[PDB]
From Swiss-Prot:
Protein's organism: Bacillus thermoproteolyticus
Protein name: Thermolysin
Keywords assigned: Calcium, Hydrolase, Metal-binding, Metalloprotease, Protease, Secreted, Signal, Zinc, Zymogen
Primary localization class, coarse: secreted
Record-listed Ca(2+) 3 binding positions: 177, 183, 185, 190
GO biological process: proteolysis
Length: 316
């Protein structure tokens, strides 16, 4: 909408107060004009029609329980935009400052979030498996990263290419969580998953097997569930990325860690310069090796560590 840029205040899903960029024109709307061509947050009103209504508020204060998922979807989309711009010199998901749209209160008791080809969509959860999913910065960044992937490598959402697609979203979701630097970890979704159980998460990148996901190619899933295991076999790539950053010895193979920032540079370059819609795990290894070679040189430690990490997870 046309209006003037304003700054509201509210509370997110976890009860934390934050400022949000809004737009005033009769109402105060969740429209942040400070980033690209805007970040826009919508109310789906417990229905499944999308996007719903651009979120309107009478007083620019967003402290109601119903407001909390919208506050966090809007704010964490901003953080994710900042990460891609400041760290990778990428302007929004398309690289040309496309408007970022999110809808909250999608459906009833909906235990998921997704990118629908055009926008982000967040359920509220059923209150037992999940609380509203936009409360997780890693979840928000995971979703926006699907848009980045779709505009760049275009990895098809099935089998190995789809597991790479998922892992890319977990990797950058985690790197955005570290960028914001509030309780960062290598787990996915811990802030919104199972409010009655402490210490768990949807997936672990450091130990995928903790939640039944493979941590070696020899343990990959080859059935048809979950689009051929896209959220299962992502564990093999997530583990490789964790090893590249943090190091470790895994199935007897030692990896010298190079840190998060270099992990992000290597995988961002692989995603945007080398991967294709049909890339498999072996091709991802080659893309990561080439990306590290471009950035750091063929004789570098960074190249050596990429190779060790893919060796450790059985990907040649
Ligand atoms: C229990 C759940 C929460 C685990 C997991 N979901 C996730 O890990 C993440 C949230 N953390 N959501 P996503 O990967 O973006 C789901 N996207 C999707 O299925 O696209 C399918 C799709 C394709 C095209 C258009 C629209 C949708 C699952 O869905 O199995
Ligand atoms: Ca209000
Ligand atoms: Ca965390
Ligand atoms: Ca996390
Ligand atoms: Ca929990
Ligand atoms: Zn995903």
């Amino acid at each position: 909408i046309t209006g003037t840029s304003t700054v509201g205040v509210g509370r997110g899903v976890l009860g934390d107060q934050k400022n949000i960029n809004t737009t005033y024109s009769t109402y105060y709307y969740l429209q942040d004009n400070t980033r690209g061509n805007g970040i826009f947050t919508y109310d789906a009103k417990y229905r499944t029609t999308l996007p719903g209504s651009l979120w309107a508020d009478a007083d620019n204060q967003f402290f109601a329980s119903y407001d909390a998922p919208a506050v966090d979807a809007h704010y964490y989309a901003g953080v994710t935009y900042d990460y891609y711009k400041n760290v990778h010199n990428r302007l929004s998901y398309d690289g040309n400052n496309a408007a970022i749209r999110s809808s909250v209160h999608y459906s009833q008791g909906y235990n998921n979030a997704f990118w629908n080809g055009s926008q982000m969509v967040y359920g509220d959860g059923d209150g037992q498996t999940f609380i509203p999913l936009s409360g997780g910065i890693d979840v928000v960044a995971h979703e926006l990263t699907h848009a980045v992937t779709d505009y760049t490598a275009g990895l098809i959402y099935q089998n190995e290419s789809g597991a790479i697609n998922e892992a890319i979203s977990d990797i950058f979701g985690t790197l955005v969580e570290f960028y914001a630097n509030k309780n960062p970890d290598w787990e996915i979704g811990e802030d919104v998953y199972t409010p009655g159980i402490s210490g768990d998460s949807l997936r672990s990148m450091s130990d995928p097997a903790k939640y039944g996901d493979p941590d070696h190619y020899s343990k990959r899933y080859t059935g048809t569930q979950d689009n051929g295991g896209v959220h299962i076999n992502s564990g093999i790539i997530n583990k490789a990325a964790y090893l590249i950053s943090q190091g470790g010895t895994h199935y007897g193979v030692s990896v010298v860690g190079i840190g998060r920032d270099k992990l992000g540079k290597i995988f961002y370059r692989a995603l945007t310069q080398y991967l294709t819609p049909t890339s498999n795990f072996s091709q991802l290894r080659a893309a990561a090796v080439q990306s590290a070679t471009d950035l750091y040189g063929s004789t570098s430690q960074e190249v050596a560590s990429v190779k060790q990490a893919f060796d450790a997870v059985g990907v040649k």
